[PDB]
Amino acid sequence: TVHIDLSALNPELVQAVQHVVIGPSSLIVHFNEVIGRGHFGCVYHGTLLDNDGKKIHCAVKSLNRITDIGEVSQFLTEGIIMKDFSHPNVLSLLGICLRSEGSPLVVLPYMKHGDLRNFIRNETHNPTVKDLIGFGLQVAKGMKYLASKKFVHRDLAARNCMLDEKFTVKVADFGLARNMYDKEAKLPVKWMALESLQTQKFTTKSDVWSFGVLLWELMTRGAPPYPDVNTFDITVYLLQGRRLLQPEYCPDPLYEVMLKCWHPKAEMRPSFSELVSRISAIFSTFI
Amino acid sequence: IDLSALNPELVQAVQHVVIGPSSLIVHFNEVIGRGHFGCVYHGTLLDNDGKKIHCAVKSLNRITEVSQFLTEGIIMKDFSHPNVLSLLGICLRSEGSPLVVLPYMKHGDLRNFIRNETHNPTVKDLIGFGLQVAKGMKYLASKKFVHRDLAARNCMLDEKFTVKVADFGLARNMEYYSVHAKLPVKWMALESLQTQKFTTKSDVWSFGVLLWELMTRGAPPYPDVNTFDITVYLLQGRRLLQPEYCPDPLYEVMLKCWHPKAEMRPSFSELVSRISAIFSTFIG
Ligand SMILES: COc1cc2nccc(Oc3c(F)cc(NC(=O)c4cnccc4OC)cc3F)c2cc1OCCO
Ligand SMILES: COc1cc2nccc(Oc3c(F)cc(NC(=O)c4cnccc4OC)cc3F)c2cc1OCCO
């Protein structure tokens, strides 16, 4: 494991990071109880207790990329901004838990019904199209909040959208932004915009493109984007002006919005504020 | 790679499939298909009886995951049908990739065989080769095995000119995060092109194309249609045209396979019955 000398941090930084830190004594991880595994890593069940209060059911995950002392300080400063994020459609972290055993941990509020993609894909779950459009709105409202804070997600998808106990879609981040700037690599090319594939420039406009793909997933009940196209022919596909086709049970107004998101020029794409109003309309009209 | 790293109940349960390195000679000098079908070499499998067996060995260099591979080994090993290429065993080692071993199929793949201009099989032979595949897929279908990549290229011929349905196991590759192979889009079913979901009914669609390959002596499907515009083409209702030497009854079976509604497509048991009648109405 990675033995980090946690006493090497700047006292001023440490004192400015007191609200975001946890302290291993306050946080209980369940290494036996694995809730999921994927590209980023394993996620575990957790038990935090705030202000010597009741047990808070949370999800814990490690960041193995963080090795040296510098990479810790990097993430702590980022965590300050992440903690300040307060929105009903954004899954903000509770805090970071440093330890001398291995790499740092990040604690987030536990999400009962899990990720958005597996939810709609699940056979037992059978939500109507009314709900599927509703999920898209929450992401947009969620992304609108982040957009106002000048946040660039760089990996917006159904998989990175989580349902709580009240089936509330919250935008989650797995730190793709970090990995890119560290190692410069496996990137989500199908969710990436035409700029991102070539230039690797990421903005709100690239997230709008990614949001377009997210809407496609919802309407197809979590189908893999570009399912009749190779992963390494996506650049050519988009260069030739071909986009995703209209799903079977997808309103024309909603698909029209998807096409706006998938505009070759970046500035021509709509803002997240606009997507809230449009999808709100489509949510109301639909039977 | 450590061959006994994870759960040690597998190795006990998967004794039959696993084969010892001592009882397997790999002729690395003799290479099959001139390296067009990956790293496939000749081999000699020492049976516990005594006498040796001519086999073909392939190195699978797409593995770190390992659990999922051996799981399929149990399923593959416990297959046995005249028109299905059986898996002899997998040879694990302390170092190197896993080696899959199969019985040597003399005349190679079916696609190149019918295309081979030197060979001149009659239409009855071609319908004969098509029927064998249906009987092979009937067996696999009955044991709930979705082939996914069913095509002439994935069918093999022995010295008795017996068609065997072979699996290369590349269908388990189809990724979220990629770093800068081909999907069989022209063999894929309509719903498979939209969902990437494969069933026995999706294999029926692919089988329809396989028949079309046979009847055209291994022509390229949809030769004047783009890879990208292949889904729309099928949604428009367009299908492969009737080959020159394709009988009308056999072409109906092809169209029957390419029904947009998947449930409406015929089973492999149903297809065998149809083609048996067609095969028996030919002189030879
Ligand atoms: C059981 O359902 C699930 C419920 C879940 N509930 C809450 C959280 C989950 O996973 C996450 C996680 F552990 C970490 C992070 N964030 C980061 O790592 C991160 C890294 N760097 C910078 C900033 C970062 O964010 C602050 C995001 C997650 F969403 C869940 C996963 C589930 O499983 C999904 C698959 O089954
Ligand atoms: C000389 O003739 C030939 C004779 C041949 N005899 C036997 C096998 C051949 O090719 C195959 C091969 F090497 C590997 C596999 N199986 C797998 O890879 C696999 C991988 N993962 C999981 C499961 C898997 O299956 C169990 C299947 C094949 F059919 C032959 C090819 C020839 O040439 C073809 C061109 O003519």
Residue B62 C-alpha, separation from nearest chain A C-alpha, in angstroms: 17
Residue A30 resides in a domain: yes
* Residue that finishes a domain, picked among B66, B85, B103: B103
Which CATH number is A230's domain given? 1.10.510.10
Q: Which residues of B are less than 8 Å from A233 in CB distance? A: 227
Residue B4 resides in a domain: no
Residue A70 resides in a domain: yes
DSSP calls for chain B: --TT-S-THHHHHTTTTB--GGGEEEEEEEEGGGGSSSSEEEEEEE-SSSSEEEEEEEE------HHHHHHHHHHHHT--BTTB----EEE--SSS--EEEEE--TTEEHHHHHH-SS----HHHHHHHHHHHHHHHHHHHHTT---SS-SGGGEEE-TT--EEE-----TT----SB------TTTS-HHHHHH----HHHHHHHHHHHHHHHHTTSPPSSTTS-STTHHHHHHTT--PPPPTT--HHHHHHHHHHT-SSSTTSPPHHHHHHHHHHHHTTS--
Answer yes or no: do A105 and A119 share one domain: no
Give residues after which chain A gaps, C-N over 2.5 angstroms. Answer: 184
Give distance in angstroms: CA of A41 to centre of ligand 1.
10
Resolution (A): 3.1
CB-side exposure of A22: number of CA atoms within 13 Å? 27
* Residue that finishes a domain, picked among B51, B84, B103: B103
Q: Which domain, by its residues, includes B40?
A: 11-103
CB-side exposure of A204: number of CA atoms within 13 Å? 20
- Annotated binding-site members of A: 35-43, 61
Answer yes or no: do B76 and B193 share one domain: no
Amino acid symbol at A169: V
- Residue A192: strand, helix, or coil: coil
Residue B65 contacts A where some CB pair is shorter than 8 Å: no
Instruction: Closest CB to A186: pick one of B178, B185, B196.
Output: B178
Q: Residue A93: CB partners within 8 Å, gap ≥ 6?
A: A79, A82, A83, A106, A107, A108
Q: What is the C-alpha to C-alpha distance for residues B177 and B120, in angstroms, rounded to an integer? A: 47
Q: Which of B109, B149, B167, B203 is catalytic?
A: B149
Residue A63 resides in a domain: yes
Answer yes or no: do A190 and A279 share one domain: yes
Instruction: State the Cα torsion B104-B106-B111-B113 to the nearest 10°.
Output: 180
Answer yes or no: do A259 and A185 share one domain: yes
Answer yes or no: do B114 and B229 share one domain: yes
Distance, CA of B120 to chain centre: 23
Enumerate helices (H) and strands (E) in chain A, giving the number of each.
10, 8
Residue B284 resides in a domain: no
Q: Which residues of B are less than 8 Å from A226 in CB distance? A: none
Name the domain count of chain A. Answer: 2
Answer yes or no: do B236 and B167 share one domain: yes
Answer yes or no: do B165 and B256 share one domain: yes
Answer yes or no: do A161 and A24 share one domain: no
Residue A1 resides in a domain: no
Which CATH number is B64's domain given? 3.30.200.20
* Residue that finishes a domain, picked among A61, A94, A109: A109
Residue A69 resides in a domain: yes
Answer yes or no: do A83 and A207 share one domain: no
Give distance in angstroms: CA of A108 to centre of ligand 1.
7
Contact A215, A257 (CB under 8 A): yes
Q: What is the C-alpha to C-alpha distance for residues A181 and B49, in angstroms, rounded to an integer? A: 60
Instruction: Closest CB to B195: pick one of A188, A223, A245.
Output: A223
Residue A92 resides in a domain: yes
Answer yes or no: do A260 and A144 share one domain: yes
Residue A261 C-alpha, separation from nearest chain B C-alpha, in angstroms: 21
Residue A106 φ then ψ, to 5°: -125, 130
Answer yes or no: do B43 and B138 share one domain: no
Answer yes or no: do B229 and B260 share one domain: yes
